[PDB]
Design a protein around this ligand. Structure first.
Ligand code: ADP
Ligand code: ADP
Ligand code: MG
Ligand code: MG
Lengths: 362, 354
């Protein structure tokens, strides 16, 4: 373990709210602040997850895939710590920092499929997240950590780079006025298109919306629309496969019903299908990485749709749950915080209590 | 007391609803006597050892001291029968009388325990509070379990159901029944009440009615408590409306599960607050009212879980709430879920950023 890794792993991550992120990109003078923060914060986050990695089973860690991820994380941490001797007022340092985040971003581009392959390899020993709770626990933390460093670095790139400026209507990747229903309809369409290619039909969308906060007004919150789209797209692909296969011998498809509700503290989206449901017994299994009732290949089969969409929801203190009526259909529900100031990053920390994690006759 | 130490050494023996049918059919009295004279003391002694791990100031409240003396007396009454032959007809008859007496003695256990929790909280922090929730879940599940056993023996052996089990429980009729009980209370208190809109799907046997083996009084209690909740939420959220949205209920029978979902437009609950809804005593009402005591949710969930079902709430804050009951569809799979006092329960009395 390089000394810089050991050092930075002793700090805990510092979580930001979406309110704070919006304020960073509020103006140009914040670049030196974002620089001074991220040059310390990114090494802390990388070092915390690196020390976790070393806790994994030897046969996992020594996969070429996990040895690659670790070598990338370590190089990225060094690249960043190189900036510690620079003045935040040094305009050349700030320019070089942006270029460095672009290089780290590119270097980390295939981290998720790379880890997912380490898992596959390791799954040799037969061991699995569906049957191994430690592996599940690690993958939630590794992937939430990744979501968090990507979000922070992208914010700085998309606000301060010359060449990569993101949507002019967003602050970094955040839409301070996210048209939630619009993102629902777009994700539904994406899913429809994939579904039609596997089955030559897909259900229709029946959408309802309720603005409890101000009745009859359009529903908007501060949100990252790509995260929202990914959760919706994964739940739509799931509802559509379940619907089509359950109903295959009927004259037509029951639509998927979606309701979007804005309340004082929460934005909630419920997606209801008549896809035959799931026995209560296997509901928890459904959120394990790799768990799929489909053959492994894509519409389905890798088993990442649920646990990853749930990490997106939980990342800013939201949640994702599924409640099924076996024999009939399923409700999938996303909860997001409606106030940017309560939308706070949910981060893993490598400490005694994490290390430890690694009466009813029921 | 000595009997308590001894019997606390055994772990409870859970029964499935299939075994209770099988052993409640013929008129089994000698066998049920032999079993219950051992099993009842084991379950009493188990929860008695657990009461003793509680804060000293809770254990000493007059209410918990009452519960403890009742449980100990019942264990003693029951242990006396270990000197009798299961072929002694006086004994068999005296055992029925003894169970009736234990049931009467325990009749006020829940309010008395609930009162103990008050004397304690008025007399004296959230970690303990979490421990109190874990304890009350186990204490009340243990009572549900002993009351279930004692009552089967009483109803079958004393002087269509098999005891309290209906082998053909008409789920939809029990729904309608509990709805009506709730509606009457709602009308009396609020002057109006929502209608029931009920749908059913038999996935297991399309077009056929939905029956499973179940304890209708348990199912009734759960539904009643959830309807009282849905009705109050609806009426209070729509207080400036000329009418009331119905409560929508769907009953579904699938391969493994019977599911019942109750949907209201009672304005729902912030997600922040969902878990605390299942806290004993948590209520947004004051204090016939429909609400105020705060036991509806946690108790209904113990009934659901006792035979390995479950009960969850999911809400769309600003709009309404779904409450959902799951029951096992197979009598062989409806097996009692029982607390046991072992080192692992004793052990039961940060990794992600705050
Ligand atoms: N709406 C749904 N209805 C029925 N089953 C579902 C639903 N959503 C997910 N599942 C079950 O959960 C599994 C896991 O979903 P997911 O994690 O998206 O992986 P994948 O779709 O790749 O199988 C699915 O294979 C399916 O068995
Ligand atoms: N369907 C519902 N909609 C809105 N709030 C609910 C609903 N069900 C329960 N609650 C909330 O949960 C609290 C606890 O419910 P319960 O345990 O039944 O106690 P009580 O009804 O005595 O308050 C209620 O007071 C209410 O605030
Ligand atoms: Mg999927
Ligand atoms: Mg209630």
């Amino acid at each position: 373990v390089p000394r810089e890794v050991e050092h930075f792993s002793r700090y805990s991550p510092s979580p930001l709210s979406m309110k704070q992120l919006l304020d960073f990109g509020s103006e140009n003078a914040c670049e030196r602040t974002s620089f001074a923060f991220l040059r310390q914060e990114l090494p802390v986050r990388l070092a915390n997850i690196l020390k976790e990695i070393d806790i994994l089973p030897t046969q996992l860690v020594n996969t070429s895939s996990v040895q690659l991820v670790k070598s990338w994380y370590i190089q990225s941490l060094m690249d960043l710590v190189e900036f510690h001797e620079k003045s935040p007022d040094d305009q050349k340092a700030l320019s070089d920092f942006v270029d460095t985040l672009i290089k780290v971003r590119n270097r980390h581009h295939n981290v998720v499929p790379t880890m997912a392959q380490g898992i596959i390899e390791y799954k040799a020993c037969t061991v699995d997240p569906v049957t191994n709770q430690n592996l599940q626990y690690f993958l939630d933390r590794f992937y939430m950590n990744r979501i968090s460093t990507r979000m922070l670095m992208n914010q700085h790139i998309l606000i301060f780079s010359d060449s990569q400026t993101g949507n002019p209507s967003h602050i970094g990747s955040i839409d301070p006025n996210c048209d939630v229903v619009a993102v629902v309809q777009d994700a539904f369409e994406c899913s429809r298109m994939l579904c039609d290619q596997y089955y030559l039909s897909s259900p229709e969308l029946k959408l309802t919306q309720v603005n409890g906060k101000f009745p009859d007004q359009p529903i908007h919150i501060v949100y990252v629309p790509s995260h929202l789209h990914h959760m919706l797209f994964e739940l739509f692909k799931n509802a559509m496969r379940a619907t089509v296969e359950h109903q295959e011998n009927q004259p037509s498809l029951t639509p998927i019903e979606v309701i979007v509700v804005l309340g004082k503290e929460d934005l909630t989206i419920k997606i209801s299908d008549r896809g035959g449901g799931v026995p209560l017994r296997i509901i928890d299994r459904l959120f394990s990485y790799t768990y799929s009732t489909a053959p492994t290949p894509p519409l389905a089969g890798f088993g990442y749709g649920l646990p990853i969409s749930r990490l997106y929801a939980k990342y800013f203190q939201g949640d994702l749950n599924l409640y099924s009526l076996s024999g009939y259909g399923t409700d999938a529900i996303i909860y997001l915080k409606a106030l940017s100031s309560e939308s706070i990053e949910k981060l893993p920390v490598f400490n005694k209590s994490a290390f430890k994690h690694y009466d009813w006759c029921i």
